[PDB]
Amino acid sequence: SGNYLGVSQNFGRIAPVTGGTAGISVGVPGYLRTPSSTILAPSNAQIISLGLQTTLAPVLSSSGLSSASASARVSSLAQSLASALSTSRGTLSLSTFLNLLSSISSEIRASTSLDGTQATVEVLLEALAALLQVINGAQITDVNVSSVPSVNAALVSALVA
Numbered sequence: 001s002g003n004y005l006g007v008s009q010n011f012g013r014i015a016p017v018t019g020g021t022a023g024i025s026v027g028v029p030g031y032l033r034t035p036s037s038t039i040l041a042p043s044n045a046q047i048i049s050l051g052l053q054t055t056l057a058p059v060l061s062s063s064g065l066s067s068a069s070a071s072a073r074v075s076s077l078a079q080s081l082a083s084a085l086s087t088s089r090g091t092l093s094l095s096t097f098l099n100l101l102s103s104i105s106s107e108i109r110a111s112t113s114l115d116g117t118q119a120t121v122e123v124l125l126e127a128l129a130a131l132l133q134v135i136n137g138a139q140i141t142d143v144n145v146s147s148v149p150s151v152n153a154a155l156v157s158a159l160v161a
Contacts, residue, residue, distance in 0.1 A: 033087045050092065051100065053079060055107055066118075069108045070125060073151065076104065077133040081142060090142045098149045111154040119158030126152060 006014045034041050042048075057072030058064035064072075084090035092100070105111040110122060130152075134143050145152060 035087055047092075050076065050079065050083070051103070054104055058108060064108060069110050070122075072108045073104070073111075073126065074129050074132075077129050078136060080144070081133050081136045081139070084139050084142050085137065089139065091144050094146070097144075098146055101146065101149055101151045105151045105154055111151050111158070115154060115158035116161075119155050123152075123155035123159070126155060 001018050003011070003014065003016045003018050005011055035046075054072045054076045057075055058068045061068040061071055080090040091097075106113075111119060111126075115122075130143060130145070144150070
């Protein structure tokens with residue numbers, strides 16, 4: 001129905017008693033349980049915090065030093081589980097996520113271009129981070145590694161170029 005001027009000037013005591021029928025999906029989203037009733041409520045915001053958190057991690061943790069660059073990627077792995085405890089299951093996409101991981105290596109600079117000696121150690125630090133991110137709460141199937149370009153094949157291609 002329509003609460004616009006309540007169709008009569010008496011509407012000042014008639015709240016918006018309209019809305020409830022959600023099409024063929026009466027309170028049952030499942031595939032897209034968005035945390036607000038507004039189609040894409042994370043309107044290139046919260047869904048981009050899966051980038052912005054690690055883009056700004058070295059910027060907020062006092063530059064891209066030999067602790068902050070690990071902290072940035074470890075923080076994304078910690079949010080991977082925390083996002084699974086929310087609407088998601090620690091996943092996003094299968095080919096579009098690779099375009100993210102190719103940038104996530106570039107912005108903290110390790111696991112791309114300069115990758116050659118520190119990157120040999122980082123393969124064990126992120127093999128541990130992939131086990132730590134499940135030790136954090138283990139939702140049974142919650143450890144995405146894509147098909148190679150997952151900020152992880154770069155740590156081997158650093159030492160075995």
